Design a protein around this motif. Structure first.
Motif, PDB file in Angstrom:
ATOM      1  N   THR A 189       0.841  -1.234   0.000  1.00  8.42           N
ATOM      2  CA  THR A 189       0.000   0.000   0.000  1.00  8.42           C
ATOM      3  C   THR A 189       0.859   1.261   0.000  1.00  8.42           C
ATOM      4  O   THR A 189       0.571   2.215   0.721  1.00  8.42           O
ATOM      5  N   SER A 190       1.911   1.262  -0.814  1.00 11.39           N
ATOM      6  CA  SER A 190       2.828   2.388  -0.862  1.00 11.39           C
ATOM      7  C   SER A 190       2.189   3.565  -1.595  1.00 11.39           C
ATOM      8  O   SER A 190       1.137   3.445  -2.231  1.00 11.39           O
ATOM      9  N   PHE A 191       2.844   4.724  -1.492  1.00  9.54           N
ATOM     10  CA  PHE A 191       2.433   5.921  -2.214  1.00  9.54           C
ATOM     11  C   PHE A 191       3.226   6.151  -3.492  1.00  9.54           C
ATOM     12  O   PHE A 191       2.781   6.927  -4.343  1.00  9.54           O
ATOM     13  N   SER A 192       4.380   5.498  -3.650  1.00  9.70           N
ATOM     14  CA  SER A 192       5.191   5.679  -4.848  1.00  9.70           C
ATOM     15  C   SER A 192       4.565   5.057  -6.089  1.00  9.70           C
ATOM     16  O   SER A 192       5.066   5.291  -7.194  1.00  9.70           O
ATOM     17  N   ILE A 193       3.493   4.272  -5.942  1.00  9.42           N
ATOM     18  CA  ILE A 193       2.793   3.727  -7.099  1.00  9.42           C
ATOM     19  C   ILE A 193       2.181   4.823  -7.962  1.00  9.42           C
ATOM     20  O   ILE A 193       1.894   4.589  -9.141  1.00  9.42           O
ATOM     21  N   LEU A 194       1.971   6.019  -7.408  1.00  7.64           N
ATOM     22  CA  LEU A 194       1.293   7.082  -8.142  1.00  7.64           C
ATOM     23  C   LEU A 194       2.113   7.636  -9.301  1.00  7.64           C
ATOM     24  O   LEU A 194       1.562   8.402 -10.097  1.00  7.64           O
ATOM     25  N   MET A 195       3.402   7.288  -9.413  1.00 11.85           N
ATOM     26  CA  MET A 195       4.232   7.721 -10.532  1.00 11.85           C
ATOM     27  C   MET A 195       5.048   6.614 -11.185  1.00 11.85           C
ATOM     28  O   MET A 195       5.818   6.912 -12.105  1.00 11.85           O
ATOM     29  N   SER A 196       4.918   5.358 -10.756  1.00 14.92           N
ATOM     30  CA  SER A 196       5.669   4.292 -11.403  1.00 14.92           C
ATOM     31  C   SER A 196       5.012   2.953 -11.107  1.00 14.92           C
ATOM     32  O   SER A 196       4.297   2.830 -10.107  1.00 14.92           O
ATOM     33  N   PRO A 197       5.235   1.927 -11.956  1.00 14.59           N
ATOM     34  CA  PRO A 197       4.698   0.593 -11.665  1.00 14.59           C
ATOM     35  C   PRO A 197       5.672  -0.294 -10.906  1.00 14.59           C
ATOM     36  O   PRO A 197       5.273  -1.337 -10.377  1.00 14.59           O
ATOM     37  N   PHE A 198       6.950   0.097 -10.862  1.00 13.32           N
ATOM     38  CA  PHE A 198       8.001  -0.752 -10.313  1.00 13.32           C
ATOM     39  C   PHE A 198       7.734  -1.095  -8.855  1.00 13.32           C
ATOM     40  O   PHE A 198       7.436  -2.253  -8.543  1.00 13.32           O
ATOM     41  N   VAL A 199       7.778  -0.081  -7.990  1.00 12.00           N
ATOM     42  CA  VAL A 199       7.567  -0.162  -6.539  1.00 12.00           C
ATOM     43  C   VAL A 199       8.190  -1.436  -5.967  1.00 12.00           C
ATOM     44  O   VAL A 199       7.469  -2.330  -5.500  1.00 12.00           O
ATOM     45  N   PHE A 225       9.583  10.759  -1.608  1.00 14.33           N
ATOM     46  CA  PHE A 225       8.360  11.075  -2.338  1.00 14.33           C
ATOM     47  C   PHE A 225       7.132  10.781  -1.489  1.00 14.33           C
ATOM     48  O   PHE A 225       6.239  11.628  -1.350  1.00 14.33           O
ATOM     49  N   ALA A 226       7.068   9.573  -0.924  1.00 15.79           N
ATOM     50  CA  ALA A 226       5.908   9.185  -0.132  1.00 15.79           C
ATOM     51  C   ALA A 226       5.741  10.106   1.066  1.00 15.79           C
ATOM     52  O   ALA A 226       4.636  10.582   1.344  1.00 15.79           O
ATOM     53  N   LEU A 227       6.842  10.403   1.758  1.00 10.52           N
ATOM     54  CA  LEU A 227       6.784  11.276   2.925  1.00 10.52           C
ATOM     55  C   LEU A 227       6.236  12.649   2.559  1.00 10.52           C
ATOM     56  O   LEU A 227       5.259  13.118   3.156  1.00 10.52           O
ATOM     57  N   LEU A 228       6.829  13.294   1.552  1.00 11.65           N
ATOM     58  CA  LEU A 228       6.443  14.665   1.234  1.00 11.65           C
ATOM     59  C   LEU A 228       5.013  14.733   0.711  1.00 11.65           C
ATOM     60  O   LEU A 228       4.210  15.556   1.173  1.00 11.65           O
ATOM     61  N   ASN A 229       4.659  13.858  -0.229  1.00 12.32           N
ATOM     62  CA  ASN A 229       3.341  13.938  -0.845  1.00 12.32           C
ATOM     63  C   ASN A 229       2.257  13.246  -0.028  1.00 12.32           C
ATOM     64  O   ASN A 229       1.091  13.280  -0.437  1.00 12.32           O
TER      65      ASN A 229
END
Ligand SMILES: CCCCCCCCCCCCCC(=O)OC[C@@H](O)COP(=O)(O)OCC[N+](C)(C)C
Lengths: 251, 117, 194, 38, 291
Positions: free
Chosen positions: A1-11, A226-230
Motif C-alpha cells: 500500500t505504498s504511495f510511490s505507485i502514483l508515478m511508477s509501476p516498479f515499486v 516522495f511518499a513522505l512529502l506527498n
C-alpha cells in the motif's frame, strides 16, 4: 500500500513496512489536517477572493483524493475508485497550475485587471472540466487497473500512467518556473526562505521528485522521500501557511 | 473653553480646560514680518523630544503634568531669535502627528511674548 | 439592469489608478481642485492637485487614503521652509489613515540648489556623502527625508525618492514605474510572500 | 471689536436652571417612550 | 436594558467607500462617483446617478423628496432633480463642503470648510445669508425640528446655534477639548449632542446653556464620526472610529449595547424619520440597516 505507485509501476518490495506505514500515517494525518484547514478557513472571509477560492478548492481536492486513495488501497467498486482518484488528483493538479499561472500573471501583468466572472469561470473550467475529459477519454480508451493493485497499470495501461505523468510533470515544471520568477522578483535572506516555505506545499513542487521514480525506480530513497512529502502535504499546508501568517495566527 | 495663557529666559505656558497629559505640546515662533516657524515639541511622557535645527541643543523644553504647565528654557539668545512665541497644542489626543501646528489661523494656541534681545 | 451599467462602471473605476499632489506654494507643483488625467503605456492616471482649500489639512487629507500613491513635491533650495516640509511629511507618515499608502517624493529645483550651493541644520557638519558639495547637499536632504521615512511603519509602506529639475520631462515614466512597483508590493502582501 | 459684540449679545440671555431642563427632558422622553421601536 | 439590534439588511452595490447617506428610499454617496438611491425594503438600486466630481463628502434628501444635493472637495454643491440631470450648481464657497441639508424644496444650507455656513436658495443660487464667526471650519450641522434654527459644529472646541431668519448667532457652547465632527438635535428641539475627536459625546442644553451630560468612558480612546438620537431620544447611537458603534442611554449616561460588523471606519449613522430602523454607512463600501 505504498504511495510511490502514483508515478511508477516498479515499486520494488525491498522494504515494505517503512514505506507502507509512512504512507498510511501521512495520509491519515493529512486528511485530518485538511479537515482542520477547511474548518479554520471557513468563516474567515479580487486577489483575496481568487486566492481563497483556489485554496478551498485545492484543499477539498486533496482531501477527497487521499480519502479515495485510502478506500481504494485498503480494498468492481475499486475499478471506479481508480477513476475517482485519477479525476480528483488531476483536478488538484490543475488547481495547482491555475494558482501558479494566476500568481505569474499578477506579478508580471500589473495594470491588466481581468473581469472577476471571467476569472472564476476560467478557473473552474480549467480546474474541473479538463480532468473530467482526461478521465472519460482514458477510461473509454482502455475499456485498466493493475492485476493486484487498484490503480492504473503499465503493460496493459501504459497510456493511462503516461496520461497521469505527463500533465503532472508539466504542471510541476511550470509551477517551478513561476516560483523561480516570483523569487527573482522578491529577492533579504529570510524573506526568500519564507516565500519558498509557504509556496512549495501549496504549489506542490515536491511531486517533481516523482521524476526519479520513473527514471531511477531501482533506488528506494526517492520512493520514501516522495511518499513522505506527498503524504504530509496536507499537514504542510495547514502548518506552513497558517503559522507563517502572523495576521491569521493573531486572528 | 480650551484657553492657553502665556508668560515670560524661561518662557512659561499654562493650559486649562483639558487634560494636559494626553495631548502633545509644541512651541512655535512667529518671526516679525514672515510666516510661522515651529521651535520644538514634547510628547505626553516627555521621552521623545525634538527641536528645530537652528536651536538644536540650545533651548530646553519640559512639561509638568501635575501642575499642568509647559516651559521653554532659552539660553544664549541671538538677535535672530526675536519673535512672538506661541504655545501650540496637538489637535488630537493619543496621536503621534500634529497636522496644523503652524497654521495661520489655528484654534488651539494663544499667546504673545514679543521677545527682543 | 442597473447592475449591467455598474459592471462597466467597475471596469472604468479599476482602470484608472488615482494619485494625489502635495507640496509647498513655492515648490514646482505645476511643472510636474485641479484634475489632470493623463495616459502612459496605455494606462490612465487621474491625479489631483488640491489648491482651493485652506491650509488646515487634518480634515480632508483623511479622505485621500484610497489613493494609489501621494506625490510629495518639496522645494530643495528654500532652506527656511525645508524643516516645515519635513514636519508635513511626518504628519503624513504617522497618520492612522494614510499608513497604508506609499509616498513618491520629488525634490524640485535641483538646478537652483546647485546654483545656490556653488555660490539651519547643524547635523550637516557631521555628515558624509553616501561638484562634491552639490551632490553632498542633495543626498543629505534625501537622507533627511528617508530617515523619517524608515523610522517607523516600514513594512506597511515605503517611500520612493527622486530628484527632478525644473526642465526635465521624464516625470511620467518615473511615476509609472513607482506605481507599478507599489502595486506589485500590494499584490505580494496579499499573498503573504513578503 | 466683533468678538466683544458677540460676547455682549450672547451673555444677555434668559436661562432656566439645569434641574428644570433635566426634568422636562425626562418628562418628554417618558411621554414619547411608547413609540420607540429601537 | 441591553439592546441586541442585528443586521436587518445589507446593501452592497457601491464600487468603493461611502461618505454619507440620508433617509427619505435611501440615498448614499460614494467615492467612485455614484450617488445611488437604494431601496430599503427590497434592496433594489432605484437610481444610480453618476457625478461630475468623484470626490463627494455628503448627500441630502429634501423632505419633498424630489431633489438630491451633493458636494465635496470641488466646492460646488450640485443639486439634481429626480423627476435625472443636474438641476443646479450652487457655487459661492472657498472650501470643501462637509454637510448640506434642505429646509424646503426652495433653499438649502451648506457648511463648508471656509469657516462659514451659507444659506443658499435654489431659484437663483444666491447666498440669502452668510453665517460666520467660528474661527475653525465647520464639519457638521443639524436643522432644528421647527427649521427656524440650526446648529453647527466647528473644528474648534465649540458649537453654535445660528438662526436662519435673523442671520446672527444666538449662543456658543465650548465645553469640548478637540474638533467637533457630528451633531444631531434632540427630537424636542431644546438640546443637542455633539460627538468630537476626543471621544466624548456631550449633550448641551439650549435653555440652560451647559453640558448636561458627558458620555465619557475611560476604556474607549477613539474619536467619534457620527451621532444620532432615536425617535424618543432615550438612546444615542454614536458611530465611533475603531470600526464600531456604541449606543448610550441618553439620560443615564450608561452603556446599553454595541453595533459591530464593519471592516472599516463608520462615516454616517442616521436613523429613520419614523424610527422603525437605523442605517449605517461604512468605509468598506457596505451600507447596513439594523433594527
Ligand atoms: C481563482 C480562479 C481564477 C483565476 C484566474 C487566473 C487566470 C487569469 C487569466 C489568464 C488566462 C491565460 C490562459 C489560460 O487560461 O491558461 C492557459 C495556460 O495553460 C497557459 O496559458 P499562457 O499562454 O501561459 O497564459 C499566461 C500568460 N502570461 C504568463 C503572460 C500571463
Amino acid at each position: 500500500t505504498s504511495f510511490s505507485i502514483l508515478m511508477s509501476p516498479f515499486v520494488p518490495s525491498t522494504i515494505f513496512p517503512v514505506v507502507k506505514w509512512i504512507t498510511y500515517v501521512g495520509l491519515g494525518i493529512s486528511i485530518g489536517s485538511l479537515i482542520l484547514c477547511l474548518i479554520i478557513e471557513a468563516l474567515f472571509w479580487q486577489t483575496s477572493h481568487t486566492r481563497r477560492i483556489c485554496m478551498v478548492n485545492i484543499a477539498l481536492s486533496l482531501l477527497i483524493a487521499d480519502v479515495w486513495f485510502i478506500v481504494g488501497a485498503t480494498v468492481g467498486v475499486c475499478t471506479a475508485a481508480v477513476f475517482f482518484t485519477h479525476f480528483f488528483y488531476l483536478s488538484l493538479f490543475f488547481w495547482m497550475l491555475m494558482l501558479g499561472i494566476l500568481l505569474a500573471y499578477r506579478i508580471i501583468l500589473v495594470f491588466h485587471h481581468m473581469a472577476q466572472h471571467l476569472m472564476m469561470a476560467v478557473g473552474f473550467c480549467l480546474g474541473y472540466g479538463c480532468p473530467l475529459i482526461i478521465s472519460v477519454i482514458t477510461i473509454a480508451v482502455t475499456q485498466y487497473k493493475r492485476k493486484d493493485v487498484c490503480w492504473l497499470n503499465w503493460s496493459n495501461g501504459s497510456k493511462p500512467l503516461l496520461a497521469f505523468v505527463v500533465p503532472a510533470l508539466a504542471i510541476v515544471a511550470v509551477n517551478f518556473v513561476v516560483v523561480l520568477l516570483v523569487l527573482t522578483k522578491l529577492w533579504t535572506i529570510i524573506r526568500v526562505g519564507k516565500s519558498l516555505l509557504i509556496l512549495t506545499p501549496l504549489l506542490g513542487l515536491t511531486w517533481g521528485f516523482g521524476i526519479g521514480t520513473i527514471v531511477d525506480s531501482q533506488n528506494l530513497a526517492w520512493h520514501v522521500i516522495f511518499a513522505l512529502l506527498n503524504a504530509f502535504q496536507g499537514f504542510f499546508i495547514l502548518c506552513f501557511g497558517i503559522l507563517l501568517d502572523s495576521k491569521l495566527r493573531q486572528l | 473653553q480650551v484657553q492657553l495663557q502665556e508668560s515670560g529666559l524661561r518662557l512659561s505656558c499654562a493650559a486649562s480646560g483639558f487634560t494636559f497629559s494626553n495631548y502633545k505640546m509644541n512651541w512655535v515662533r512667529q518671526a516679525p514680518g514672515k510666516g510661522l516657524e515651529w521651535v520644538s515639541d514634547i510628547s505626553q511622557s516627555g521621552a521623545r523630544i525634538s527641536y528645530t535645527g537652528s536651536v538644536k541643543g540650545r533651548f530646553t523644553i519640559s512639561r509638568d503634568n501635575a501642575k499642568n504647565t509647559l516651559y521653554l528654557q532659552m539660553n544664549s539668545l541671538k538677535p535672530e531669535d526675536t519673535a512672538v512665541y506661541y504655545c501650540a497644542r496637538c489637535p488630537a489626543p493619543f496621536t503621534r502627528d500634529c497636522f496644523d501646528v503652524t497654521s495661520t489661523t489655528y484654534a488651539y494656541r494663544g499667546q504673545g511674548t514679543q521677545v527682543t534681545v | 439592469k442597473i447592475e449591467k451599467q455598474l459592471q462597466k462602471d467597475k471596469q472604468v473605476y479599476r482602470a484608472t489608478h488615482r494619485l494625489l499632489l502635495l507640496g509647498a506654494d513655492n515648490s514646482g507643483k505645476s511643472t510636474i481642485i485641479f484634475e489632470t488625467k493623463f495616459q502612459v503605456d496605455k494606462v490612465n492616471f487621474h491625479m489631483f492637485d488640491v489648491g482651493g482649500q485652506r491650509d488646515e489639512r487634518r480634515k480632508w487629507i483623511q479622505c485621500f487614503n484610497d489613493v494609489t500613491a501621494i506625490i510629495f513635491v518639496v522645494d530643495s533650495s528654500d532652506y527656511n521652509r525645508l524643516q516645515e516640509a519635513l514636519n508635513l511629511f511626518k504628519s503624513i507618515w504617522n497618520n492612522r489613515w494614510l499608513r497604508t499608502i506609499s509616498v513618491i517624493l520629488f525634490l524640485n529645483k535641483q538646478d537652483l540648489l546647485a546654483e545656490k550651493v556653488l555660490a539651519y541644520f547643524p547635523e550637516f557638519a557631521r555628515y558624509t556623502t553616501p561638484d562634491p558639495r552639490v551632490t553632498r547637499a542633495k543626498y543629505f536632504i534625501r537622507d533627511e527625508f528617508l530617515r523619517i521615512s524608515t523610522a517607523s511603519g516600514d513594512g506597511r509602506h515605503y517611500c520612493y525618492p527622486h530628484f527632478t529639475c525644473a526642465v526635465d520631462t521624464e516625470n511620467a515614466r518615473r511615476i509609472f514605474n513607482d506605481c507599478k512597483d507599489i502595486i506589485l508590493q500590494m499584490n505580494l502582501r496579499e499573498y503573504n510572500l513578503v | 471689536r466683533k468678538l466683544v459684540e458677540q460676547l455682549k449679545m450672547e451673555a444677555n440671555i434668559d436661562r432656566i436652571k439645569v434641574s428644570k431642563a433635566a426634568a422636562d427632558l425626562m418628562a418628554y422622553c417618558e411621554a414619547h417612550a411608547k413609540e420607540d421601536p429601537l | 436594558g441591553r439592546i441586541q439590534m442585528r443586521t436587518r439588511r445589507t446593501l452592497r452595490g457601491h464600487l468603493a467607500k461611502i461618505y454619507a447617506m440620508h433617509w427619505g428610499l435611501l440615498v448614499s454617496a460614494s467615492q467612485d462617483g455614484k450617488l445611488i438611491i437604494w431601496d430599503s425594503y427590497t434592496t433594489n438600486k432605484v437610481h444610480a446617478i453618476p457625478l461630475r466630481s468623484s470626490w463627494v463628502m455628503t448627500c441630502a434628501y429634501a423632505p419633498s423628496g424630489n431633489y438630491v444635493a451633493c458636494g465635496g472637495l470641488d466646492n460646488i454643491c450640485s443639486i439634481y432633480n429626480l423627476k435625472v440631470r443636474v438641476s443646479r450648481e450652487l457655487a459661492g464657497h472657498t472650501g470643501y463642503l462637509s454637510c448640506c441639508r434642505f429646509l424646503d424644496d426652495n433653499q438649502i444650507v451648506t457648511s463648508s470648510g471656509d469657516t462659514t455656513c451659507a444659506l443658499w436658495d435654489i431659484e437663483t443660487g444666491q447666498q440669502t445669508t452668510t453665517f460666520t464667526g467660528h474661527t475653525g471650519d465647520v464639519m457638521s450641522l443639524s436643522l432644528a425640528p421647527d427649521t427656524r434654527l440650526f446648529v453647527s459644529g466647528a473644528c474648534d472646541a465649540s458649537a453654535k446655534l445660528w438662526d436662519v431668519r435673523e442671520g446672527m448667532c444666538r449662543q456658543t457652547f465650548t465645553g469640548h477639548e478637540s474638533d467637533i465632527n457630528a451633531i444631531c438635535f434632540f427630537p424636542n428641539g431644546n438640546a443637542f449632542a455633539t460627538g468630537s475627536d476626543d471621544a466624548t459625546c456631550r449633550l448641551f442644553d439650549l435653555r440652560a446653556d451647559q453640558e448636561l451630560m458627558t458620555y465619557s468612558h475611560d476604556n474607549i480612546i477613539c474619536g467619534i464620526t457620527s451621532v444620532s438620537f432615536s425617535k424618543s431620544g432615550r438612546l444615542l447611537l454614536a458611530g465611533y472610529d475603531d470600526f464600531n458603534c456604541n449606543v448610550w442611554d441618553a439620560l443615564k449616561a450608561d452603556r446599553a449595547g454595541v453595533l459591530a460588523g464593519h471592516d472599516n471606519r463608520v462615516s454616517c449613522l442616521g436613523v429613520t424619520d419614523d424610527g422603525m430602523a437605523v442605517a449605517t454607512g461604512s468605509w468598506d463600501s457596505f451600507l447596513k440597516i439594523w433594527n
